[PDB]
Design a binder for these strands. Structure first.
Length: 1364
RNA sequence: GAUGAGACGCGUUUUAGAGCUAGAAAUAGCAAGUUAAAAUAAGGCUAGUCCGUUAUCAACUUGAAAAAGUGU
């Protein structure tokens, strides 16, 4: 008949349940396909799908870009060879051929083993004359003599293959390369960022200090010595340390809880910098960027040491000098070692396995490791001066190819290449003819806006061709339609506003955006002068004055500058108090002051006609990074400004994107008011509404406008709808799975669509890493509050962050060790006698946070009202609460709630606020999921153009079902099994349907669609529970979940009574039977047969481990190339199995080669997958199988389920390992007992029920033994781990007299033995139980393979024993 | 809150850099090392200075494929 679906969506699981009108879960008979004797199964319509997390596309992206880079570099070399070919043919016939076959061994090499000249003599002569390529290069730059064309090619190819970075635009100059200028730019950025107590550096000689050859710390200290006002541990000092190559910690600089260390050389610098910036804002971005630039400058100056006469080729010459110095230091070192320390000489120069010099050259030992190894050796010997000063400076026995070379610009290599081409120009005419060609090969770089040079068959490419010919670096300008390509690039890179589609998002550094956020922060500011004694929000004229006078004059605006230079100067206000903002304004007009600094025309910046122009400029500077396209898009504004300001404007760059569009900020308009969002921000009368409040407020047309615009025109794919969502690929996977689950479920019900689909987005439980974070935050809160107040409670009563987890103790320190309602001190060691009271009663709102809790000796002190605490207490305690407020012991809202009786008490607006707080879902992703399901379910229409909604999609908060569990003892213990997902889905269905039955008029709150909004008057009564069933009022008490309860305890202690049967007032429908329905729910939760399905997946990804192992005679290794034998060349190891396969055939055995029929489980690697799926029989026959049955070849992905004896189940993890496949179903009584036993001390409830719960735990001690018996039988049946079971049984016997709480906790830990999935090690008391793995996989070959549908309701069971 | 475009430098693996002197070998004494080529998922056809590690995937039937169907 009629039914509804409950859903619990997660990132690794999807819970689902089908309920009837009586809140019951149907049990149905399902057909069983396959080849067994089972043709039918009885199943409950409840279950949960399990699956591995979806992965982000980052790794794939990195790999892809890397491949493109390798390809394009190789293509550059091919261009060079293409130019050199014809003239090389006259010089050497097999030069390039010999170069190509360099990797091959002499056996597979058709030509001479000697690459360059083909004969050993010229090769030896060459290598002796030039021990590095830089020698040859430096010669080719400095020799007028005719040179061999082959060596010329070697130089050019070396310069092209490793061409250097493109971080610097234009010609190389000291302004953007020298240490001094970049240091000045750095301190300029610093002073710009601060301007209050800034550092001024004019006399300083940054080059002489930073570029000097000394140790890092001493260089840092030497720079610090020139700055008396700043210190090494300061922010600037840490920046310098960062630029030098150290690892500074910025934790102390910002008082962050977690230490934040940054190292530029470290590969993980970027995401760390992004985290830090995420914490402190993107204003400091340019600062760290300047630090990076300075670092590159210092490194580049450190390598280019040969600045003696500045002749020739400085880079190559410097590498030469490094070679010479290396030789000298080496021979000197060998001399010293041989002289003083004859022993262990072999370990240093021959062993190489323990990071010696031989390990430094022939082994995998870095420079820092080599330094670390030889440091004590140098310390022990004498005459080791000079070698150590070079070692500490990281310039001892350096190689020419190191990690430092990243700082080398391409302009240098361009210089040497131009030089060489110029030197050999007249000798070889084709160098003169093809000079610009080679130079173009080195200098050409594909722009971001052009992308992959594809021709239609690339998923990632978008570029447009103005011709049909192969793109080269030389004809790129005349073949690539840069305009259309840039346009497509723009269309792709512009994301759309999540709030408002069909509207492009503005840049993060847009002027209108900065105006928006500035006014948004400014509108929430209240000021109190001397006389009015009441807080007043800023008026429109005041806001405009503040913006124009302050925000358009300074980058940073502080409260002191605000009161001093505005209120006192213009408003003539001597004393002012501000609550809205803290120390300064977080928002700023950065772009405004940037452009002001650039063009130096202030009036032009304030013309409202030039807004679109400036926005266009900012958009252009945000989108592109290439100089030419920027010049093209800024050519229209050439008449506006010229010369210096134009170039400087083109040099300016912006990065980042906002979240909002222009049409949202200052486009859509309220019908009645005629004011946009920004207009409301600037002027809104007495009360000032922020952005989120205008979106929220239903009194305006904005919410309607945002909603009606959400659906894009036409209907696209499901995949696109999911892709458009704002969430991780994991939750998107979960969403898709959820949709499919709904489809199968409605198929099961004879294609009848449900009345309701209730949705919950499962919350991620504490990762415990934040479990220390909360204690740290509350601890810091306590210390700051104490330091502010001045009561040395921490002295007389010392505490640590661990003990502060207790509610009453935390409140004790929060309340200055004083009673909240009474003027008396609290008893430190009698907190058990003390009660925790709610400021807003549970009858009105379910808020158990610290925000709504107080500690007092008796909650009778709150007074006689069923409301907030009385006025008689507020008037008395207002001062103390005001002292606790400004000391940050409590929040503003808590103070507002404590002093609500002074303002009349609770109101209809407050109660409505409570209802909206309980019933509405803030998460956007959930609303979008509900939108998807609604769109998929309802597709019928009528005669008019009206949408018929047959299926209602209800959205629920997790708090409702969670509190539902806690209030009526339907307790959850995740460690037992995976049933709790399904259970959560069921309870969601129940609560959702109950709520839609009880309050149909509140449909607009949870249900997706365009409904009658309704108001606050019709829902909430004026006062009391007046006239039952004689009024239209739905509820006087603002808590929606009260009708489930039999009794309602107010803040007085008075017990209100509710009927045994709850019914709707308007339609006279029974919504809840407090006996039978709770009995039904408990019965459902007690059912042992729940459909748990693990999604089977083919493994995808890299072929194997990426480490290239050296050559060995083993045949296990995989060839790097099909021609390259691993025995001679080496290869990869540890392949990854995509899936396994079941094969029945025959093989050759013995000398007689007799065929024996076999049934085996073969693993198909990801590499082998293509070949196997292309033609399986030939693949298997090549593998060695004979007479294969193509029909019986069975695909077995990971987590393939098999059933064996006595209902024992195993999942296929790999070709050679299994996982546990069974779920231990534990009775509800044991679950509740375990919860109550574990949650013994932390009950957090009223004493009456709590004591009864304690007694409930104590009375049922036998439950421990019963549970152990359950686990024992279950393990003996399906786990089969006798040793571990014996160990945990004995360990259980040892601690029988132990307290029930810890014992129950250890049983909860013990559940890991029986958990579904891969075996894991767990700790039981003192005993540690290691995993009992299932290494054997043969039993599967004769078990029953179970093919499960997504819900598990449809089964296809294959008895593999019958196959053979 | 996901998805994308450009580029650099290491790393690793083979080969090229002739090891020299004794001793029947076994094994001993030293001389030197810094660089380069090439590969960097095997590969694919659509042959692009493109694509190849994300997403997606129970079984069966029908389809080249998107996708439809099959079970009170």
């Amino acid at each position: 008949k009629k039914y509804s679906i409950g859903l619990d969506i997660g990132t690794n699981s999807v819970g689902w349940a089908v309920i009837t009108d009586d809140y019951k879960v149907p049990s149905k008979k399902f057909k069983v396909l396959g080849n067994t004797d089972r043709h039918s199964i009885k199943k409950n319509l409840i279950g949960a799908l399990l699956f591995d997390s979806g992965e982000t596309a980052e790794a794939t992206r990195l790999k892809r870009t890397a491949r493109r880079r390798y390809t394009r570099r190789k293509n550059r070399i091919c261009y060079l060879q293409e130019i050199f070919s014809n003239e090389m043919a006259k010089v050497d016939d097999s030069f390039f051929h010999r170069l190509e076959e360099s990797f091959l061994v002499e056996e597979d090499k058709k030509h001479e083993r000697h690459p360059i000249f083909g004969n050993i003599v010229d090769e030896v002569a060459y290598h002796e004359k030039y021990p590095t390529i830089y020698h040859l290069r430096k010669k080719l730059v400095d020799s007028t003599d005719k040179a061999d064309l082959r060596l010329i090619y070697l130089a050019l190819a070396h310069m092209i293959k490793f061409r250097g970075h493109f971080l610097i635009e234009g010609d190389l100059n000291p302004d953007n390369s020298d240490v001094d200028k970049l240091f000045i730019q750095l301190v300029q950025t610093y002073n710009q960022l601060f301007e209050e107590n800034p550092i001024n550096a004019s006399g300083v000689d940054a080059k002489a200090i930073l570029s000097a050859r000394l140790s890092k710390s001493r260089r840092l200290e030497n720079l610090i010595a020139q700055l008396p006002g700043e210190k090494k541990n300061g922010l600037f000092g840490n920046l310098i340390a960062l630029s030098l190559g150290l690892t500074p910690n910025f934790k102390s600089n910002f008082d962050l809880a977690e230490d934040a260390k940054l190292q530029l050389s470290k590969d993980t610098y970027d995401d760390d910098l992004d985290n830090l910036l995420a914490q402190i804002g993107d204003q400091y971005a340019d600062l760290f960027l300047a630090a990076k630039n300075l670092s590159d400058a210092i490194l580049l100056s450190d390598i280019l040491r040969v600045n003696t006469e500045i002749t020739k080729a400085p880079l190559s010459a410097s590498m030469i000098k490094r070679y010479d110095e290396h030789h000298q230091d080496l021979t000197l070192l060998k001399a010293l070692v041989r002289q003083q320390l004859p022993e262990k000489y072999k370990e240093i120069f021959f062993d190489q396995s323990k990071n010696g010099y031989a390990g430094y050259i022939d082994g995998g030992a870095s420079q820092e490791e080599f330094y670390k190894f030889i440091k004590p050796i140098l310390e022990k010997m004498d005459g080791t001066e000079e070698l150590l000063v070079k070692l500490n400076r990281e310039d001892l026995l350096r190689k020419q190819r190191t990690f430092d070379n990243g700082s080398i610009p391409h302009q240098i290599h361009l210089g040497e290449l131009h030089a060489i081409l110029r030197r050999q120009e007249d000798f070889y005419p084709f160098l003169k003819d093809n000079r610009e060609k080679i130079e173009k090969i080195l200098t050409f770089r594909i722009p971001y806006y052009v992308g992959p040079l594809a021709r239609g068959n690339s998923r990632f490419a978008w570029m447009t061709r103005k011709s049909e010919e192969t793109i080269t670096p030389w004809n790129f300008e005349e073949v690539v339609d840069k305009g259309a390509s840039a346009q497509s690039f723009i269309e792709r890179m512009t994301n759309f506003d999540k709030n408002l589609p069909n509207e492009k998002v503005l840049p993060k550094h847009s002027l209108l955006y900065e105006y928006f956020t500035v006014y948004n922060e400014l509108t929430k500011v209240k000021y109190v002068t001397e006389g009015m004694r009441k807080p007043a929000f800023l008026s429109g004229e005041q806001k405009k004055a503040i913006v124009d006078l302050l925000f358009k004059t300074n980058r940073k605006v502080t409260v002191k500058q605000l009161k001093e230079d505005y209120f006192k100067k213009i408003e003539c206000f001597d004393s002012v108090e501000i609550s809205g903002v803290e120390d300064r304004f977080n928002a700023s007009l950065g772009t405004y002051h940037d452009l002001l600094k650039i063009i130096k025309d202030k009036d032009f910046l304030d013309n409202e006609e030039n807004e679109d122009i400036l926005e266009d400029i900012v958009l252009t500077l945000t989108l592109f990074e290439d100089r030419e396209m920027i010049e093209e898009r800024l050519k229209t504004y050439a008449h506006l400004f010229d010369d210096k300001v134009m170039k400087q404007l083109k040099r300016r760059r912006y990065t980042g994107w906002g979240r909002l569009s222009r049409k949202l900020i200052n486009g859509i308009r309220d019908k009645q008011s005629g004011k946009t969002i920004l207009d409301f921000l600037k002027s809104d009368g007495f009360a000032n509404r922020n952005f989120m409040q205008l979106i929220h407020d239903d009194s305006l047309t904005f919410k309607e406008d945002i909603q009606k615009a959400q659906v894009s025109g036409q209907g696209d794919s499901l995949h696109e709808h999911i892709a458009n969502l704002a969430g991780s690929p994991a939750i998107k996977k979960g969403i898709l799975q959820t949709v499919k689950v709904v489809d199968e479920l409605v198929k099961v019900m004879g294609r009848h669509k449900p009345e309701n689909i209730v949705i919950e987005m499962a919350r991620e439980n504490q990762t415990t890493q934040k479990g220390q974070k909360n204690s740290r935050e509350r601890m810091k809160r306590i210390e700051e509050g104490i330091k502010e107040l001045g009561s040395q409670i921490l002295k007389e009563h010392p505490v640590e962050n661990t003990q502060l987890q207790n509610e009453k103790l935390y409140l004790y320190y929060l309340q200055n060790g004083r009673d909240m309602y009474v003027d008396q001190e609290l008893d430190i060691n009698r907190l058990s006698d003390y009660d925790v009271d709610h400021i807003v009663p549970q009858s009105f709102l379910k808020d158990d946070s610290i925000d709504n809790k107080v500690l007092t000796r008796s909650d009778k002190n709150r007074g006689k009202s069923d409301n907030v605490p009385s006025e008689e207490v507020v008037k008395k305690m207002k001062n103390y609460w005001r002292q606790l407020l400004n000391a940050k012991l409590i929040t503003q809202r808590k103070f507002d709630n404590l002093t609500k009786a002074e303002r009349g008490g609770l109101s209809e607006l407050d109660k409505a606020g409570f209802i909206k707080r309980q019933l509405v879902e803030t998460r956007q992703i959930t609303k979008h999921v509900a939108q998807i399901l609604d769109s998929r379910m309802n597709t019928k229409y009528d005669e008019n153009d009206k949408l018929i909604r047959e299926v209602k999609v209800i959205t629920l908060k997790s708090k409702l079902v969670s509190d539902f569990r806690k209030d009526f003892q339907f307790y959850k213990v995740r460690e037992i099994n995976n049933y709790h997902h399904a259970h959560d889905a069921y309870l969601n269905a129940v609560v959702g349907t109950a709520l839609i039955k009880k309050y149909p008029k509140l449909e607009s709150e949870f249900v997706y669609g365009d409904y009658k909004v309704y108001d606050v008057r019709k829902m909430i009564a004026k006062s009391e529970q007046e006239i039952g069933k004689a009024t239209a009022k739905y509820f006087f008490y603002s808590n929606i979940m009260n009708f489930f309860k039999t009794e309602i305890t107010l803040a007085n202690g008075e017990i209100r009574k509710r009927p045994l049967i709850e019914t709707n007032g308007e339609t006279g429908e029974i919504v809840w039977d407090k006996g039978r329905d709770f009995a039904t729910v408990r019965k459902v939760l007690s059912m042992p047969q729940v459909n748990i399905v693990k999604k089977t997946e083919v493994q995808t990804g890299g072929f194997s481990k990426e480490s290239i192992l050296p050559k060995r005679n083993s045949d296990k290794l995989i060839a790097r190339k099909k021609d390259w034998d691993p025995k001679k060349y080496g290869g990869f190891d540890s392949p990854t199995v995509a899936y396994s396969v079941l094969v029945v055939a025959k093989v050759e055995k013995g000398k007689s080669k007799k065929l024996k029929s076999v049934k085996e489980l073969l693993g198909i690697t990801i590499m082998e997958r293509s070949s196997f799926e292309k033609n399986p029989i030939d693949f298997l026959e090549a593998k060695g199988y004979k007479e294969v049955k193509k029909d019986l070849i069975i695909k077995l992905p990971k987590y393939s389920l098999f059933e064996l004896e006595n209902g024992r189940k195993r999942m296929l993890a790999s070709a050679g390992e299994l996982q546990k496949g069974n779920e231990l179903a534990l009775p509800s009584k044991y679950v509740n007992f375990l919860y109550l036993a574990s949650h013994y001390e932390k009950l957090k409830g009223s004493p009456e029920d709590n004591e009864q719960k304690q007694l409930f735990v104590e009375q049922h001690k036998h439950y421990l033994d019963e549970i152990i018996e359950q686990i024992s039988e279950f393990s003996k049946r399906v786990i089969l781990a006798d040793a571990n079971l014996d160990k945990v049984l004995s360990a259980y016997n040892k601690h029988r007299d132990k307290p029930i709480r810890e014992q129950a906790e250890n049983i909860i830990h013990l559940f890991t033995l029986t958990n579904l999935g891969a075996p894991a090690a767990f700790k039981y008391f003192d005993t540690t139980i290691d995993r009992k793995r299932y290494t054997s996989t043969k039993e599967v070959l004769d078990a029953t393979l179970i093919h499960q549908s997504i819900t598990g309701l449809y089964e296809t069971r294959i008895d593999l024993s019958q196959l053979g």
